[PDB]
Amino acid sequence: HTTLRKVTANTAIYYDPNPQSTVVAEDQEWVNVYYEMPDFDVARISPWLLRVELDRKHMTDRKLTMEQIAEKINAGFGDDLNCIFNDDNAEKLVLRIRIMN
Amino acid sequence: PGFVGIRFCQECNNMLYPKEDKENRILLYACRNCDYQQEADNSCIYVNKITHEVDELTQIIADVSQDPTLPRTEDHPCQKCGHKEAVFFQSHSARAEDAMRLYYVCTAPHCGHRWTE
Amino acid sequence: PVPPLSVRPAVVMQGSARNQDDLTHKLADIVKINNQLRRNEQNGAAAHVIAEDVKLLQFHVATMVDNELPGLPRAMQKSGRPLKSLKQRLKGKEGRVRGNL
Amino acid sequence: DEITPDLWQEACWIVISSYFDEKGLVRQQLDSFDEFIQMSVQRIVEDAPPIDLQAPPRYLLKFEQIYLSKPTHWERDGAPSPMMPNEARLRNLTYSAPLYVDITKTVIKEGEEQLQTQHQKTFIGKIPIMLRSTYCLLNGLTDRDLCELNECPLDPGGYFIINGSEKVLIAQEKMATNTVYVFAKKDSKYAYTGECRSCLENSSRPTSTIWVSMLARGAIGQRIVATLPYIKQEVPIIIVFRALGFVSDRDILEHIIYDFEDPEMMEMVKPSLDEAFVIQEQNVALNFIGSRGAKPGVTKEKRIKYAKEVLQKEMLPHVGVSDFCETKKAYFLGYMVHRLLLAALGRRELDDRDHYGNKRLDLAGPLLAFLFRGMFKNLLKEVRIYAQKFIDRGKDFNLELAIKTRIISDGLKYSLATGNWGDQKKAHQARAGVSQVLNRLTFASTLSHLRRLNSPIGRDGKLAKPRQLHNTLWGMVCPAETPEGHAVGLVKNLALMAYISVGSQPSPILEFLEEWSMENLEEISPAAIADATKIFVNGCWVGIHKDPEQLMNTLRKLRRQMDIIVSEVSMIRDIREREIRIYTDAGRICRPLLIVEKQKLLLKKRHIDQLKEREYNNYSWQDLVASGVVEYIDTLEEETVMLAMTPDDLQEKEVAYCSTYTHCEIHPSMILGVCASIIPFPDHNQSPRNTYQSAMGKQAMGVYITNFHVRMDTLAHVLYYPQKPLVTTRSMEYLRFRELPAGINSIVAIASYTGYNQEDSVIMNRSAVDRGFFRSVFYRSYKEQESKKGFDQEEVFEKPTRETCQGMRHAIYDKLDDDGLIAPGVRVSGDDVIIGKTVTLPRYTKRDCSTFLRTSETGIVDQVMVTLNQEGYKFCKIRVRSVRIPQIGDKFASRHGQKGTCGIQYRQEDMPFTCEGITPDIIINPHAIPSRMTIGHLIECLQGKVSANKGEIGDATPFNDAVNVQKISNLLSDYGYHLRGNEVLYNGFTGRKITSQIFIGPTYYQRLKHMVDDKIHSRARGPIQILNRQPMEGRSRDGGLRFGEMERDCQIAHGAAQFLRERLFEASDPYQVHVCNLCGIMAIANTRTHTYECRGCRNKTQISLVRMPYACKLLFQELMSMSIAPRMMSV
Ligand SMILES: [Zn+2]
């Protein structure tokens, strides 16, 4: 059994009012690469963001990828909890959640 | 990222809780006892270090160099003062599995430099 | 049912003082409160007085057949030792079944 | 100046001898009792509140001073005389002294009509006195004076005499008080719990435990709660802080979190704040506390008052019980929360329940103080009722008649007599095992019983953690001496130089800290606590300091100079956490150690020189302690100490281990106790063997005490020819084993000879036994008294007669005299009569109640003593003397766990012999050595051969590098013997040499109390019990042996049904009942008239005879008592 805590490095809640200009500087690349096309209901977005940082060691030890994790989150909570994420190439394995309304 | 500290009201000295102002779409820290509000400066409300990547050098204090029961070594001189002798000890702290790591402290008085190999 | 004298023998001490069994002391309490309740129902007594007498009679009978009732006070005797009810006479080890049969 | 290594073994033991010249072995008992009498009784009397009684006139009755005279005894005429302890032992008196209290009663009615009447020396009770204490008549007496009084000069004292019975108070372990201990229970709703058993300095109430716990994860985060006393619901810590007047969250976290740069602590306390926001003022918080309590007042006013009283009196009394102490209590509760958070954050280790630094030994003084508080409170209560019933009538009363002194007297006497520690009415809530009968079987047993500790965890508990030998027992408790039965690890024994602190007041220390640069806790700002070091004194956080190092230097200098700090004060500096904890309270086990300079001892050669002439220049141990050369270190201060096992560790080495030692062992062998200090070479045995010897030295025969001729003990064994061991340790010089030894040096041969020593057995020499080898005398005392309790029936000692006495056995009474007492020198066999007592009836007008011998003894009457008991009827003690010659079945043991019974005895011509005709006194089997690995037995045998051939006493002190096996062998080869202790032996029967050269030599053997003649028992149709008609229990009752459940199961497996029925029916309790064939209930049978009828069924023809055990009939009748109908249906 592997829970998100076993593979997670650190979680944090931010107040990001507009995803286009994020609070963090290193997450501005993939967030805009995701937002330039409307994939979800941008109007049904909440300014409270939940950024979780993974760690490469535990990701590799279980042959796990952000795709599977995001699928599991979007299945357990449906579309009510939007999740986005970068590729498995950046130096920090990070994925950002928001609550939909 | 770093942790986030508690901040208190300026009137009732109670803790300020987070709140969001839709009008300006901006984070505020407001007291639920009085009617004080403040413009946040961090924008981060909560931080959990699951990995617990804590620098135990911050937990060490130089006074431990006065302990007669700690081992001393002459092989690791101090980088800050050049003193030869130094006490060393292990983490002995919970939530640290790789705790065989040694932490050194300079025994020179008023230097108290701490480091790790 | 009050048992016979064999079940509760009155052992004579070194002198002439005949010591009675715990069962006999308990039956003495039971007969005392039973007679007391009989007169209180026959002659002038308040309803709450009869209720208290019935409660005490219940306590005596219950502690005669089972002394370790949770919460209730243990049936006492001289020297501050609790009485040995019929249940402790055969409850476990050193009782009738394991200790004498 | 420096003591060189070649002199060290002398110097250290010289130091050790000085210690035992100053202190002794029962110093803890005497010091505890002395502190109790000098201080505790007066504190208890003064700490009681004055009893103000009024209808009008009023009276206060303030008790102000105590006076404890010497032990005296009041006869029937009433003449007070000084009572000696031996007279108390003989006459079954209680060695107690009267306690008188000064009482002051002032009359106050009106109009300033005041006048005081003082009753000087009002007899308030009798207090039993510990022997050889300051208030004992044997105090300061010389050995000549003690012998003049028929007392043994080697008797250590340390016990009480209650009703002639020597009672010893066992030190009771308990968790230390006023200290915060953070534990974590695996199976509980709380993740972490920080408890603090709090108790005010001068005890007046039980320990009020306060818990501060953290709820286990799984609302949002981890919530901190506080289980206050007298409140049956958890209370958030923030609510408690607000109820103490700290409403602002900033103030509460100022008190809890001392470093605001640490967000981890902050987020971990945040859930508690988030849970308490609706409550924001002191009165509302107090109302919440009162509502959560088990007595919720309907009106919030009394709720708030109750919460105020709880938070002021029951919450943390050690911080202070007066008013305006809310700041100190808030700081301390914040410290508890801080400690809990440090544990939850992993920054501090959980506290170890087993650490003896966390424990206290409740000795005779503090235990008698608990009794005296309860008993004095009961006495003041009785005085209140008595005086109230008089002033209600509006008239004066006599306090002498108000004081019924039996409360204190009978209470202390009962508690010490029975061991049930508590009020006589609460005989089940009371905890037994305190105050046991002193073991007088051998001097080692007496010393060990007087140095006995007890862990009241409960023998039923099967958790091994409290039974384990903790690391912290080093030097404080014997690693070996412990019972091997059901109380392994719970009953312990002091190490030889272990001293239990007696207690001291923290006032001088606190005053000096005030004069020194410490800052009080109410005067500081919390911002200063971050970098500063906390200072606790007896658990109370009293202030903070800025340079803890030079504070510790100052305090250590003060304690080593015998300045304001006394020697027994512990002063621990924890460095990583900045506490400095100072302890002065009682019960702290500590031990003396040699202080170490830079890398040198402070014990120079001049101290050894002055110690050598200890008897001329009165330079004693106390001068060694006052010189700052020795220091008492407790278990908790040992954590901060760096010990040197020997001064050799202080030498500069090719690779230095420490180079910063602070103390040194006086000698490592002092880690052993009294009974383990008799084992020679205990470091060459397997440790279980050392434990078994430490248990078996206590059953060894010897001379238990020098004045045994005058003692009327119930059982006593004295060896004819005790010998000091040829191979001894340097610790027995202080145990007085050389003056009262408990064994004989036996020429033991480890050999297989005829097969009668196999499986832990020995072959003894019949010729040696004929010469008095291991012969003993067994003294048995019988007591009797003739009671004139009333004119209805009176007993009397007089030679019974066949014509007047009724219950007169067929045994002859001719050995008795006209006084009814046998005379000394008369040979008495089993069932014989020694006291002829007759009791008047209501075989006429008197019945025989004579005292017979305990059956199958066959001794000679040693002496007869007649006196009067406390109430004053005639009282007799008869000591009978029986010579026990060792025989097959008697148990013997060496000092190495090597026990065994005598298999057979061969005469000197039948035993194997050396070329020089030496036969072994004992032959033990070689198979007892290999699995046991008692190499100390072999080394002792070899050392003893060297000692006997050299004319010296071997040194078997445990850790001695100047004595090894090669040296002993080289020494033995110089006396014309095989260097390894072997010899050519010849077969005693044939005279041929034995092919295998046998290992033979002197070894110290012990004869143990367990003789076969006291164990052999047989039965064939003897007496039966009354309730169930089954054989009695015991040899003494001529009882039968129990055929138990396991025997039943074994015989069921065998398939032996008739044997099983014989054992469980026919050899125990055969019986017959008559049963009604209709209802199956036991009928009424009349076999004389042959009329059988069931009252139930009203039939008299269908009855059947059933052969059943009597116990089964009794069972069925006890079931019918319960309204159960066990119907034995025969069809
Ligand atoms: Zn506010």
Ligand SMILES: [Zn+2]
């Ligand atoms: Zn340095």
Ligand SMILES: [Zn+2]
């Ligand atoms: Zn019938």
